């Protein structure tokens, strides 16, 4: 398969694109299971129409991630973990993790 893929970020209320990037790193770490999927992408441009104190609350949205490379990779539930680090040289790295609800267990889907 081609070594470069494309990443599309969408919202789970209207199917509206949020941003588009190029993939950089993918890490994949009664019975049970305990696994994590961390995705790191590169310089991303946000959607031209989507752009228009802190309380411990979870009144957030849900998001989907699509990898295109035909090879299709679907992450239905994702959460972006943005870390804040200021640098010396001054003059965009985005990370997210795959989620999973407790009744429709699904963390990664592959379509060939």
């Amino acid at each position: 398969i081609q070594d470069t893929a494309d990443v599309y970020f969408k919202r789970k209320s209207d199917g509206k694109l949020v941003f588009t990037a190029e993939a950089q790193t993918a890490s994949f770490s009664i019975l049970k299971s305990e696994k994590e999927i961390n995705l790191t992408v590169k310089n991303a441009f946000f959607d031209l129409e989507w752009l228009a104190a802190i309380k411990a609350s979870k009144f957030s949205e849900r998001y989907e991630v699509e990898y295109r490379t035909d090879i299709y990779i679907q992450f239905p539930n994702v959460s972006p973990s943005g870390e804040f680090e200021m640098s010396l040289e001054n003059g965009p790295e985005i990370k997210f993790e795959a989620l999973a609800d407790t009744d429709t267990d699904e963390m990664a889907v592959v379509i060939e």
Binding site: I30, E36, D101
Partner: protein, 697 residues
């Protein structure tokens, strides 16, 4: 003249009592390359004996008794300032040397309440306002910090102090970079992360500071200054450089290469090894930066430097812990590394979770002994008190949130190896379970971090009560019919119950019964959640619950199997199993033309295979269809087989019983032994060795 020795040292070092700490490796410039001071005291020569005479006066009180009052005062000041730094004697007269780090900074220890009290206090002088500006920058109040720095820069010239002027220029520039990158990250990325647009600094502030900071190079500040200051404070010259913290990185790289080469060869170093140099340099740089009130939280480079130094030290300590010896080596070898409060704070503040996980992968921090546990408990209790106080009210400092939540997370993650008391553990658990933000720790991460805290503290009654209140709150949150928790780990609310039962097997909750005994068939999305928590309530409440809800779905079936409700299987369960395994193939043969690999994360089918191997489910119709998954070459036909289904990861994924049964079979044993020998030979992993030494021979 013996009384003339201190004239030269004073005439070259007089400017250096205007600071709070200077580096021993930074003393080379003040003497203009005459001697060399090692990182652990001792001086080495490199046309009159200059530094030898002064240290000779120290060991003979008779010789220094002939000095006058001014000479005695100069000697006392020089001796006290040397004692404050760490310069001791010459290398030829050196002896036993032990160095302990002691940073006197309120910022390092995270005394936020003390810093607030000091900020509210009245001003005294210019240095007090310097410390005040640093404390306000640390505490997330950035606008007042910028204003105070500007006023300090304004009045430093009128107060006739140049070091304050220069350091305040540098601090204001670095905090300007801080606000610039802060607004840049808050605008284009805070929309998706924080779920909001949050712009604390208004347009006027940025409009002012961008105009003021234009054409303000970090370099040339030293040159654009009086020549007397150029001669007197050359030691500060290296601060004014864009490519800052670069020589330390190069020296760290060279020392890392030396240490790795010595680890590979297996050599025996003598005296001051390279790792000791790394530790001393790291401590020296830390003390220099922190004690001088310099804004370096705004750097990922300082964090990288400290991370690399600590990781190298841990790896080296692991190497000396696990190494072989010989008879000649014993004739030379014949000083273990242990973690203290300062190392704990360094790792907590400067490491991310990924770095700590990498350290745990490569090294074994369990075998490392931790000391000064009272101070560590105090630090953790302070962190928990701060987080609960700040998030228990209607207020939060978002910038301080971004600069503080990472350290709080790392400290609570590294508190696994530290033994705590009952009250401190209770406070930490309450602050972690009731007030930690949900965007940083989901339910799975929360459970993992709570569970890892019981490795050395067990589970007293107070923690169980706190978990009980947390579960009651979750149950009340599940009243709404539009709630659903998502975990990045696969661990959900039905794990606090298992954790509770592992320590308090006999236990019922007095508060969950009422919400269970106040149910109705229309109160869905609460019956489902309470089915997770069935073993936690009374038997009467249990039966009242299992009346409303039957086992009519597969998820309820595996739930009842999981919580121990169903021990012996029941009819019409293989009905559901065969219905699922038939619908999967019914969808399969229509997607073959479509070509969908559909490697979902659902583990129902492998679990069904494992159930098959234990003979609890056994029926001819089970193998009627066979799905897409490769894992049925294990439990449906161990002779057909393939390259692999997912065995290589599943030997480490499985448990002891199934691996032991795997060792008890006919033909796949040789394939397993071949793949295991290949893995252990062409890799380094303890798990592949344990399953090779215990369950296989």
């Amino acid at each position: 003249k013996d009384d003339e020795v201190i004239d030269y040292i004073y005439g070259k070092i007089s400017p250096l009592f205007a600071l709070q700490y200077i580096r021993k490796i930074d003393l080379k410039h003040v003497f203009e390359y005459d001697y060399h001071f090692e990182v652990n005291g001792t001086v080495v020569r490199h046309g009159f004996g200059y530094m030898e005479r002064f240290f000779e006066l120290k060991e003979s009180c008779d010789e220094r008794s002939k000095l006058s009052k001014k000479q005695y005062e100069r000697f006392n000041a020089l001796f006290n300032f040397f004692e404050k730094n760490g310069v001791i004697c010459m290398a030829k007269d050196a002896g036993t040397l032990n160095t302990s780090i002691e940073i006197n900074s309120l910022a390092y220890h995270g005394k936020y309440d003390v810093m607030k009290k000091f900020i509210e206090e009245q001003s005294v002088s210019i240095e007090d306002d310097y410390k005040k500006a640093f404390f306000l920058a640390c505490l997330g109040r950035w606008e007042e910090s910028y204003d105070l720095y500007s006023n300090i820069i304004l009045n430093s010239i009128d107060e006739s102090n140049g070091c304050v002027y220069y350091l305040s220029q540098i601090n204001r520039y670095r905090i300007y970079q801080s606000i610039t990158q802060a607004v840049t990250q808050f605008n284009g990325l805070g929309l998706l992360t924080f779920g909001r647009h949050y712009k604390p600094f208004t347009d006027e502030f940025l409009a002012r500071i961008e105009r003021e900071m234009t054409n303000f190079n970090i370099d040339d500040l030293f040159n654009g200054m009086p020549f007397e200051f150029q001669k007197k404070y050359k030691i500060l010259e290296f601060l004014s450089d864009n490519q800052f913290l670069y020589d330390d990185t190069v020296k760290l790289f060279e020392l890392t290469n030396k240490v790795r080469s010595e680890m590979s060869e297996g050599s025996y170093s003598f005296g001051m090894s390279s790792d000791i140099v790394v530790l001393l340099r790291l401590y020296d740089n830390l003390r220099f930066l922190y004690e001088n009130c310099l804004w370096s939280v705004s750097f990922h480079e300082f964090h990288q430097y400290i991370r690399n130094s600590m990781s190298l030290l841990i790896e080296k300590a692991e190497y000396e812990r696990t190494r072989d010896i010989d008879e000649l080596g014993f004739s030379f070898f014949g000083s273990g590394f242990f973690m203290e409060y300062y190392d704990f704070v360094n790792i907590s503040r400067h490491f991310k979770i990924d770095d700590i996980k990498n350290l745990e992968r490569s090294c074994s921090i369990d075998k490392i002994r931790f000391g000064e546990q009272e101070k560590i408990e105090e630090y953790l209790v302070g962190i928990a008190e701060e987080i609960t106080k700040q998030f228990s009210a209607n207020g939060m400092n978002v910038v301080f949130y971004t600069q503080f939540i990472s350290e709080a997370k790392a400290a609570l993650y590294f508190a696994k190896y530290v033994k705590l008391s009952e009250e401190g553990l209770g406070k930490i658990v309450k602050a972690l379970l009731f007030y930690f933000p949900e965007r940083d720790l989901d339910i799975g991460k929360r459970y993992v971090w709570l569970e890892r805290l019981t490795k050395c503290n067990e589970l007293p009654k107070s923690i169980i009560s706190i978990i009980d209140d947390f579960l009651v709150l979750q149950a009340e949150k599940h009243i709404d019919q539009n709630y659903s928790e998502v975990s990045s780990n696969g661990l959900y609310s039905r794990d606090y119950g298992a954790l509770i039962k592992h320590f308090e097997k006999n236990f019922i909750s007095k508060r969950l019964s009422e919400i269970t005994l106040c149910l109705t068939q229309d109160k869905q999305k609460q019956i489902d959640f309470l089915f997770k928590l069935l073993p936690l309530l009374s038997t009467n409440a249990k039966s009242h619950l299992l009346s409303f809800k039957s086992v009519e779905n597969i998820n309820d079936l595996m739930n009842g199997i999981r919580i121990g409700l169903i021990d012996e299987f029941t009819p019409e369960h293989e009905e559901l199993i065969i219905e699922y395994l038939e619908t999967r193939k019914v969808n399969y043969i229509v997607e073959k033309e479509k070509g969908i690999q559909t490697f979902s994360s659902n583990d129902y089918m492998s679990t069904f295979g494992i159930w098959y191997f234990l003979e609890e489910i056994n029926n001819s119709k089970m193998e009627e269809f066979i799905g897409m998954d490769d894992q049925y070459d294990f439990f449906v036909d161990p002779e057909n087989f393939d390259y692999k289904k997912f065995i290589p990861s599943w030997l480490k994924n499985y448990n002891d019983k199934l691996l032991g049964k795997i060792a008890g079979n006919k033909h796949m044993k040789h394939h397993v032994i071949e793949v295991l020998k290949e893995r252990v030979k062409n890799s380094n992993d303890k798990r592949y060795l344990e399953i090779l030494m215990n369950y296989f021979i």
